[PDB]
Amino acid sequence: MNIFEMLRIDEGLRLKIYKDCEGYYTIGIGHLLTKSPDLNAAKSELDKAIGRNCNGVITKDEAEKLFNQDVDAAVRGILRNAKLKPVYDSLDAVRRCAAINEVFQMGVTGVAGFTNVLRMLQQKRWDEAAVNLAKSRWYNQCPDRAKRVITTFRTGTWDAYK
Ligand SMILES: [Ca+2]
Ligand SMILES: [Cl-]
Ligand SMILES: [Cl-]
């Protein structure tokens, strides 16, 4: 088990443009196209991401190329953020996977606003953090995409994906 297998379970594959739990336009392995309510914008966003007229539908190899890029972006997003990096770097290996997962799904900005959870995580207060994440807007709207991640932050094992 690793971050790619983890996200493949959580986001699955979709080779046609769907609206995600947050209500935004998405494709592949959880690749967000835009937060605009306009489908045709997301349709052009796909074409721009791949380098061709898709046009709303991509292949499996292209999805995996986007997936590598997005996981890279999530890691870089964490390391570049002053709030997230010190918390991240305090985490053990498995919880760091949960952290990459949450940023991949929610984006850096959303996550960095969870100020008290970040504090609880840095001080290894796993139970409270789990509870506080459980009452998030992320969790309440995306409970199936979020559930295993919260549990991972609590236990620091891979058991929720087993
Ligand atoms: Ca690392
Ligand atoms: Cl892999
Ligand atoms: Cl969900």
Side-chain angles (χ1 to χ4, degrees):
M1 188 62 56
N2 57 57
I3 183 58
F4 305 94
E5 287 162 335
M6 185 197 198
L7 282 164
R8 282 186 199 107
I9 295 175
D10 280 340
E11 306 273 3
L13 253 311
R14 302 270 187 187
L15 311 223
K16 161 168 67 170
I17 300 176
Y18 69 113
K19 287 159 78 175
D20 86 324
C21 51
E22 295 178 31
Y24 310 130
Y25 292 101
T26 301
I27 192 152
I29 306 170
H31 181 82
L32 177 72
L33 294 164
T34 184
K35 284 153 190 258
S36 177
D38 175 13
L39 165 69
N40 282 259
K43 281 172 157 200
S44 71
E45 285 308 292
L46 182 60
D47 298 29
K48 144 127 89 82
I50 308 302
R52 67 175 184 87
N53 295 12
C54 290
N55 70 338
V57 171
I58 59 170
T59 64
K60 201 265 276 292
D61 266 24
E62 290 161 343
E64 286 283 339
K65 195 185 185 160
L66 283 175
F67 188 39
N68 264 353
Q69 296 175 2
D70 289 347
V71 169
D72 188 57
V75 171
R76 284 183 347 250
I78 290 163
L79 297 179
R80 293 176 182 181
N81 184 285
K83 299 200 194 279
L84 298 187
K85 190 201 185 297
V87 180
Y88 186 86
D89 282 338
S90 76
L91 295 174
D92 50 275
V94 180
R95 294 186 175 86
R96 287 183 182 211
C97 274
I100 294 166
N101 189 313
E102 194 183 354
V103 166
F104 183 103
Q105 306 204 38
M106 274 184 56
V108 168
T109 304
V111 169
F114 283 73
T115 305
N116 268 40
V117 172
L118 294 172
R119 180 164 64 94
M120 284 157 190
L121 286 172
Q122 219 188 307
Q123 277 136 62
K124 304 200 191 205
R125 294 197 263 155
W126 308 129
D127 287 2
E128 291 155 277
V131 177
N132 279 231
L133 276 176
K135 75 189 72 169
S136 66
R137 141 75 182 70
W138 174 47
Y139 183 88
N140 279 12
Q141 291 226 156
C142 313
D144 301 292
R145 237 91 137 219
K147 55 159 273 161
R148 293 182 287 278
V149 184
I150 318 294
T151 294
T152 302
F153 271 121
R154 197 191 177 172
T155 64
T157 70
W158 281 118
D159 288 345
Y161 294 83
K162 150 266 311 304

